Scaffold this active site. Structure first.
Site, PDB file in Angstrom:
ATOM      1  N   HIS A 207       6.742  37.768 -31.158  1.00 23.88           N
ATOM      2  CA  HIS A 207       7.742  38.503 -32.048  1.00 23.88           C
ATOM      3  C   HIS A 207       7.260  39.097 -33.264  1.00 23.88           C
ATOM      4  O   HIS A 207       7.921  39.733 -34.092  1.00 23.88           O
ATOM      5  CB  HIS A 207       8.854  37.357 -32.285  1.00 23.88           C
ATOM      6  CG  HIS A 207       9.643  36.798 -31.347  1.00 23.88           C
ATOM      7  ND1 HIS A 207      10.525  35.850 -31.412  1.00 23.88           N
ATOM      8  CD2 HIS A 207       9.581  37.176 -30.002  1.00 23.88           C
ATOM      9  CE1 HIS A 207      10.953  35.559 -30.246  1.00 23.88           C
ATOM     10  NE2 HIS A 207      10.554  36.450 -29.254  1.00 23.88           N
TER      11      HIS A 207
ATOM     12  N   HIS B 111       7.660  36.381 -19.601  1.00 23.67           N
ATOM     13  CA  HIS B 111       8.673  35.470 -18.861  1.00 23.67           C
ATOM     14  C   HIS B 111       7.996  35.285 -17.336  1.00 23.67           C
ATOM     15  O   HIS B 111       8.225  34.315 -16.736  1.00 23.67           O
ATOM     16  CB  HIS B 111       9.706  36.512 -18.438  1.00 23.67           C
ATOM     17  CG  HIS B 111      10.722  36.286 -19.718  1.00 23.67           C
ATOM     18  ND1 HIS B 111      12.065  36.317 -19.543  1.00 23.67           N
ATOM     19  CD2 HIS B 111      10.522  36.107 -20.945  1.00 23.67           C
ATOM     20  CE1 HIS B 111      12.604  36.394 -20.824  1.00 23.67           C
ATOM     21  NE2 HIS B 111      11.556  36.240 -21.836  1.00 23.67           N
TER      22      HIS B 111
END
Ligand code: HEM
Ligand code: HEM
Ligand code: NA
Ligand code: NA
Lengths: 713, 714
Positions: A244, A77
Site C-alpha cells: 500500500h 493475490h
C-alpha cells in the site's frame, strides 16, 4: 443433466485423484518446463515487462500512467490464496487464471492485468509459464518503481485445469459470518484449513470484520489469516504497508454498476468480466473493490509515505462513492495525486485494515520502528515479498534462473549440500543385509520409512524423507510416529550408519536420511521374501541430513499427520469421515486411486498400523507382502457390522457361524463399499494378481520414497 | 458439502468428460491388452463354473426355484438394455452396471446380488475375463442351462474403471412421471432425444403401463418407441420380451416401503450391496424388487412355449400385487404355476401390463400369434435378437473375440467386406496423392470430404468411420452436413482416379474408394502445409474396403447423421443445448481430449472445412494453408466481439480502435477465447513458438480421426 453428485451428494469423490492427466495437458509427454525456462532470456522478458508498465491500453487505462500497482496486487493475490494447513493455494500453479479464482470478487479486474500480459506470454511461449510470469511481473513492477527486490526463482510449471481445493462451504459469495455454512465458530475461530474470513476474499475484509469498521478488531482477523498463510507480525506489517505504498483502490461509483464475473460472463466478453456501466467503466471511473483510497503522494514510486501518513494524521470514518467504509485524514490538505486529472489532488485516505497497523498495539510497535527506520522496512518487505511469492515452490533445488537469492532461509526447510561420494549399488545391498541382520523387523522398517517419507505434500512441495527430520523435533515426538518405537529404530540405524561410514575410504558416507529409506526398502524386500517372492526395491541415494538449528519447529507443525489412513490413524474425532481424509491424504501424496489402493492394502499386511492395531490386518501372515487384504476383504463369506461401542469400527464375522474373524475401520471397509474403489480392490484380490500386486506395491512405495527428490528431477 | 465450480457456474461447459478414462484411474498397466488376455482364457472352464453356479444357492439371496437363471438373464438384459441408438451410449460393452448410477437405478434393484454371486468366478479367472464380458456370458449360460440354444457369443468388452458420462435425463426425482419441471416428454408423448427410457431409472418402459396407467395398448406404444430407440423392430421386440418372460419371476412379496437404500446410498457395512429389506426374511420367498408379483410359466426354469399359450389361452383381469402394483391374473384359471420355494403352493397365471401389450397391440398380436403357431420361428428370432441385444454396441466384427462368434454376417453389424487382394504400398500412395493434387481438387474439398467420411465414428458403440466408403451410399451421400452437391463432384473425380489406377495394375492389386478418400484427404493436408511453407508427412494406412448399398441399412444409418458438427461450424437447426456443449459431446464421441479438440478445430477452420464455405471462424488471410492463424487472431485483444442484433449466436469481431469489421464467428468459434480452460489451450497454440507444434499436433489428431474405426489394425 442429473449427475451422480446430484443423486449421492455425500459419496466420496475420487476424481480429485485423477486430475492433471496426460489427456488435459497440451504439452507433449516429454515437455520439461525447467529445460525451457533455463534457456529463456530472462533479462529480455524483464525489459519487455518494464516497458509495459507505462504503456497504457485504452480498454483498461493505467492509473497514474503506470500499471505497477495493478501488477503488484495481481502477484500478491496469486500468492495470497496459500494456506499453511494443507499447503494448498499459492502462486505456484498459476491457478488465478482458472476457476474459481479467476472470478473471486477479491480478484476483480485482475482479469484485465493478466490480459495485459498476453503479448509477452505470446512472445516467449512455453519458455515462461503463466505461473512464473505473474510473479515476475510483480517483481518488475517493484523494480520499475525504485524498490530493490530480494530475488526471483522460476520453475512454476503451468497447470491446465482447476485444482480441487476446499475454499469453504458457503453458497453465496462474500457471505458474512454466522450463516448456515459459517466458517467461524466459537470465539471467532476460523475453520481449518481455511485462511480467509469470507468466501472469495484473499485474507480479510478491507472495511473490517463482517464489514464493521473497527481497526482493532480488524487486526485480529489480519493476524489470524496471515498466520494461516505462514506470516508473522513483522512480515505482515511489512507486506501490507509495502504493498500500500503503491497504486490505489477503485470505487468511483456504486457496485451495482458492475456485471458478471468472468466465469458468468457472456461468450463475447472473451474471458474478461466485471464489465461496468458506470460512466466509462474503466480508468477514472473504475470500480473494483468499491473503496476509493490512494495511500501515498507518489503512488508510482517507492517511498516511506505510507507510514508518514498513517502516523502524521488522525483519521475520520467516511464512505466511498460506492458506500464502503473507509478513512480520510482530518484537516489535511489535498496532497495525493489524482490518477488521471493532473489538475486534481486529494486528501490522504486509508482502509480500516491499514489503520490496524497503528491501532493494534503489537502492530504499532513494528510500524513505528519501520516509520523511524525505513531501511528496516524496505529489507523486511523485500524478504517477505520473496517468501510470499515462493512459499509454495518447494525445495531450493526447484528454483531456476539467474536471480535466485543465495541466502538460505529457515522457512525453506533447507537441506545441506552433499559434498562426498555416494553409496553405489553394492553398498546399498551391503547396508540392506546389515539392516536385516540387526533384528529390526519388517514392521519396524516399513513403519519408520513410511513415517519419514509420507510427510510430503504436493500442494506446496514441503515434507518428505530428505533431511532426516524424523529424528528431530517436532517429528520425533508426533504421536503417529510412535515416538518410543521410533527412537529405538533410529538408534539401531545410527549404529549401522556409524559402522559403515567408519569403514569407508575416499570420503564416501551414507546419510541417515538415505539409510532410513534404504532400510524401509530392505523391509519391503524381506516381506516379499517372506511371501516367497524375490524382488529388488529401487533406491536412489543422495538425501542429506538437516540439523535442528536448520529446522523451524513451529512451521513444521502443519505437517503433522493427524489423519493417516495408510497407518489406520486418526488423532482425534473429526467432522469429515475418515475415508474422505484418506482420499485427501492420497491427493497430497500425489497418488492415484489405484496407487492409493495398492499402497494401503500392502501397508496393512506389513504391520504399518500405528500401535500395532489389528484393524484392517486381514491376514494370517503379517509381515509378508501378499494381497491378503483384498482377498479377505472381498470374501462374501464374511459379514460386517458396526460395533456397539464405536460405530466407526466394524466386526467381520463368518456369515454362517458368527465367529469373529476381523475388525476394521471405515478406511479399511471403504474398499469394499465404494463402487470405484471396490472395482480396484477386485483386480488386486483376484487369483492372478500376486505378481501384479507386488510389482505395483513396490512401484508406489518407491514413488513415495522419492516424492521430494527434486535433486533427481 | 464444499462448494465447487459447478455450484457457482452451473451452466459453464464441462470438459472433464473429455479426460475420463485416463491412465490415472486404470489399475491395469498402460500396455495391458484385454484381447490378448481373453484369447488365452479357458472359456469352456468358465462356462462349466457358470453352469455349476446356477443351482448353487447362497443363503444371503436364495435362488428362486433353486436356479439363478432368470435373475442372470434379467441381469444381462439390463446390462445391454441401457443402449440408445441416438448417441450409441449405454449398453453392455463397458460393464457400467457395476458403477454409479446404473448400479443403483431402481430398475437394477437386486442385480447387485446377481453380480456378487459372480465374484468368485471373476476372482478365479481375473483379468482374462472382464466384468463386461462375464455379465453377458452368464446370461448366455443361464439360457443354455435352461434349455435354450444361443446364437453365439463374442468376448472383447474391456472393462472400464469409473462412471461414464452419460446424459440419462434431467429429472431430479427417481422414476418421476412425465410432465414435471424436467419432463422428458413433450407434445404427443414425444420422448426427448437421446433418451430411450420413459422414466429416470428405468431400462425401457414402466411395467404397470405409461406413467403407471394399466393400459396395454398405450403401454405398447411406449414399448415400440423405446425399443426402436434401442435399435429393435417389432419382431425383435416381441421375441425378446416373450423370450425373456419365458423364465423366472418378478418380486413383490410386500410393501415397497420395506426396501432400504440403493447401493450408492447404503451404509459402509453393506459392502456394496443395497435394497436391504425389512419385509419378513428380506429375501427368497419374501423378496421385493419391482413390487410386482408375477410368474409367467408353468416351468420357470426351463425353456417352453408356455408364454404365448398363457397369453392367448386366458382372459385377463386387472389386480394388485402384495405391494400395491398393477398386474393381471388369468380369469378362471386353475393354480398351475409353481411357487419358487414351497412345493405345496401353486399359483394362477399372471402377466404384466406390458406383456398383455404383445396381444392387445394389433401389430404385435400378429407376430405373437405367428410365434405361438410356429414356436421354431419364435426360438430362432429370440436367439438372434438376444445376440443383437448383447452385441449391438460392440462395433465391427473385427472386435469380436473367441471360439463362439457366429459366422453369419448380420446387417446390423454394418459389415465391411474382406480384403482379398494386395494393398497399395508407399510408392502407390505417392502416385495417387499426386494424381489427386493434379486433378484440381482443392485443399478445402479434399479435407472436407475426408472429414465427412471419417468423423461419423462414435466410440460409444464403435459405429461409423471411413471404412466402407459409406459416404458414397444412401443416406450419407445426401446429408446436409456432407454438402451433397460438392461431395458428388469430389467422389466423381476420385472414382475416375481410382478406376484409372486399378485398371493399370497387375497381380490383383487395387485401391478401395474408402482408402482413396482418406488418402486424398491426407494429400489435402500435405498440400496445405506446403502452402504454409512447411514440408510435412501425413501418415496413411491402407486396408479399408468398400461396403455395398445392400450391406448398409439406411434407417440404422440415420442416427449417425451429424446434426451438429462444430468442427465444420454446422448446426442443422436450433437446439435447446448450446452449440459449444454439442461440440464437446461430438469430441467425446470422437474420443478426443480437449487439446486434440482444440487443435483439430483451429486447423479445420483454416483449411476450408466449414459447411457452405461459411466464413465464421475463418480467422486467416491465407485460407487453405495449414497455420495456427485461428489461435493468433482469436486471441488478439485488438479485436472486440459482440453478438449481432439479427442473430445472437453470431458474433462480429471489430477493430477496437476503428470499429472496422474484421471477422465473424459462432459460439463454437468464440468459446475457445472465453472458456478459461479452452482459452489456456488456445494460448499454447497461438504463441510465437508454436507453429511447428500446431502442425505436428494437427497431423497427429487428423490421423487419429482417419483411423478411429481401424480395428483390422488393432
Ligand atoms: C490486510 C491485508 C490487505 C487488505 C485488506 C488489502 C486490501 C486491498 C484492497 C481492497 C485493494 C483495492 C482493490 C481495488 O479496488 O482495486 C487493494 C489494493 C492494492 N493492494 Fe492491498 N490489501 C492487503 C494486503 C496487500 C498486500 C500484502 C500487498 C502486497 C504486498 C497489497 C498490494 C496492493 C496494491 C499494490 C494495491 C493497489 C492496486 C492498484 O493500484 O490497482 N495489498 N488492497
Ligand atoms: C417391455 C419390456 C420389459 C419390461 C417392462 C420388463 C419388466 C420386468 C420386470 C418388472 C421384472 C421383475 C423384476 C423383479 O421384480 O424381480 C422383469 C423380470 C425379468 N425379465 Fe423383463 N421386462 C421387459 C423385457 C425383458 C427382456 C427383453 C428380457 C430378456 C430377454 C427380460 C427378461 C426378464 C427375466 C428373465 C426376468 C425374471 C427375473 C428373475 O427371475 O429374477 N425382460 N421384467
Ligand atoms: Na499450493
Ligand atoms: Na455404448
Amino acid at each position: 443433466g442429473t449427475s451422480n453428485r446430484d443423486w449421492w451428494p455425500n459419496q466420496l469423490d475420487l476424481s480429485i485423484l485423477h486430475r492433471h492427466s496426460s489427456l488435459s495437458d497440451p504439452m507433449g509427454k516429454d515437455f520439461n518446463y525447467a529445460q525451457a525456462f533455463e534457456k529463456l532470456d530472462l533479462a529480455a522478458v524483464k525489459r519487455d515487462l518494464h516497458a509495459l508498465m507505462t504503456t497504457s491500453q485504452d480498454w483498461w487505462p493505467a492509473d497514474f500512467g503506470h500499471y505497477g500497482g495493478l501488477f503488484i496486487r495481481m502477484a500478491w493475490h496469486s500468492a495470497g490464496t496459500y494456506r499453511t494447513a494443507d499447503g494448498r493455494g499459492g502462486a505456484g500453479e498459476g491457478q488465478q487464471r482458472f476457476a474459481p479464482l479467476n472470478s473471486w470478487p477479491d480478484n476483480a479486474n485482475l482479469d484485465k492485468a493478466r490480459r495485459l500480459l498476453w503479448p509477452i506470454k505470446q512472445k516467449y511461449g512455453r519458455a515462461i509459464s503463466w505461473a512464473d510470469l505473474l510473479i515476475l511481473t510483480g517483481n518488475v513492477a517493484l523494480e520499475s518503481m525504485g524498490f530493490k527486490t530480494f530475488g526471483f526463482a522460476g520453475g512454476r510449471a503451468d497447470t491446465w485445469e482447476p485444482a480441487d481445493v476446499y475454499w469453504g462451504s458457503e453458497k453465496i459469495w462474500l457471505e458474512l459470518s454466522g450463516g448456515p455454512n459459517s466458517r467461524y465458530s466459537g470465539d471467532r475461530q476460523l475453520e481449518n484449513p481455511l485462511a480467509a474470513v469470507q468466501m472469495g476474499l484473499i485474507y480479510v475484509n478491507p472495511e473490517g470484520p463482517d464489514g464493521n469498521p473497527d481497526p482493532v478488531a480488524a487486526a485480529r482477523d489480519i493476524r489470524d489469516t496471515f498466520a494461516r498463510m505462514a506470516m508473522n507480525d513483522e512480515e505482515t506489517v511489512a507486506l501490507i504497508a509495502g504493498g500500500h505504498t503503491f497504486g490505489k483502490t477503485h470505487g468511483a461509483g456504486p457496485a451495482s454498476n458492475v456485471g458478471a464475473e468472468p466465469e458468468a460472463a457472456g461468450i463475447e466478453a472473451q474471458g474478461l468480466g466485471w464489465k461496468s456501466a458506470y460512466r466509462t467503466g474503466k480508468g477514472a471511473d473504475a470500480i473494483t473493490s468499491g473503496l476509493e483510497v490512494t495511500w501515498t503522494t507518489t503512488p508510482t514510486q517507492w517511498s516511506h509515505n505510507f507510514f508518514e501518513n498513517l502516523f502524521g494524521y488522525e483519521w475520520e470514518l467516511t464512505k466511498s462513492p460506492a458506500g464502503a467504509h473507509q478513512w480520510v485524514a482530518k484537516g489535511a490538505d489535498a496532497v495525493i495525486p489524482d490518477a488521471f486529472d493532473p489538475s486534481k489532488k486529494h486528501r490522504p485516505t486509508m482502509l480500516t485494515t491499514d489503520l490496524s497497523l497503528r491501532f493494534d498495539p503489537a502492530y504499532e510497535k513494528i510500524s513505528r520502528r519501520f516509520h523511524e527506520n525505513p531501511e528496516q522496512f524496505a529489507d523486511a518487505f523485500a524478504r517477505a515479498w520473496f517468501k510470499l511469492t515462493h512459499r509454495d515452490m518447494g525445495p531450493r533445488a526447484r528454483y531456476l534462473g539467474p536471480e535466485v537469492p543465495a541466502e538460505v532461509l529457515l522457512w525453506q526447510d533447507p537441506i545441506p549440500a552433499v559434498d562426498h561420494p555416494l553409496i553405489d549399488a553394492a553398498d546399498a545391498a551391503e547396508l540392506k543385509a546389515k539392516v536385516l541382520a540387526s533384528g529390526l523387523t519388517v514392521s519396524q522398517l516399513v513403519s519408520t520409512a513410511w513415517a519419514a517419507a509420507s510427510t510430503f505434500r504436493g500442494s506446496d512441495k514441503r515434507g518428505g524423507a530428505n533431511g532426516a527430520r524424523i529424528r528431530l523435533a517436532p517429528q520425533k515426538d508426533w504421536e503417529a510416529n510412535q515416538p518410543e518405537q521410533l527412537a529405538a529404530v533410529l538408534e539401531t540405524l545410527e549404529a549401522i550408519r556409524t559402522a559403515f561410514n567408519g569403514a569407508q575410504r575416499g570420503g564416501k558416507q551414507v546419510s541417515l536420511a538415505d539409510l532410513i529409506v534404504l532400510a524401509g526398502c530392505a523391509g519391503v524386500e524381506q516381506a516379499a521374501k517372506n511371501a516367497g517372492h524375490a524382488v529388488t526395491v529401487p533406491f536412489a541415494p543422495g538425501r542429506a541430513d538437516a540439523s535442528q538449528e536448520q529446522t523451524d519447529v513451529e512451521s513444521m507443525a502443519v505437517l503433522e499427520p493427524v489423519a493417516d489412513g495408510f497407518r489406520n490413524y486418526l488423532k482425534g474425532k473429526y467432522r469429515v469421515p475418515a475415508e474422505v481424509l484418506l482420499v485427501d491424504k492420497a491427493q497430497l501424496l500425489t497418488l492415484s486411486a489405484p496407487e492409493m489402493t495398492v499402497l494401503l492394502g500392502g501397508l496393512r499386511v506389513l504391520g504399518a498400523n500405528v500401535g500395532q492395531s489389528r484393524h484392517g490386518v486381514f491376514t494370517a501372515r503379517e509381515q509378508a507382502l501378499t494381497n491378503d487384504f483384498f482377498v479377505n476383504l472381498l470374501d462374501m463369506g464374511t459379514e460386517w457390522k458396526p460395533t456397539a461401542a464405536d460405530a466407526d469400527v466394524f466386526e467381520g464375522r463368518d456369515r454362517a457361524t458368527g465367529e469373529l474373524k476381523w475388525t476394521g475401520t471405515r478406511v479399511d471397509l471403504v474398499f469394499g463399499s465404494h463402487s470405484q474403489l471396490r472395482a480396484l480392490a477386485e483386480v488386486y484380490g483376484s487369483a492372478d494378481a500376486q505378481e501384479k500386486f507386488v510389482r505395483d506395491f513396490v512401484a508406489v512405495w518407491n514413488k513415495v520414497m522419492n516424492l521430494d527428490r527434486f535433486d533427481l528431477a
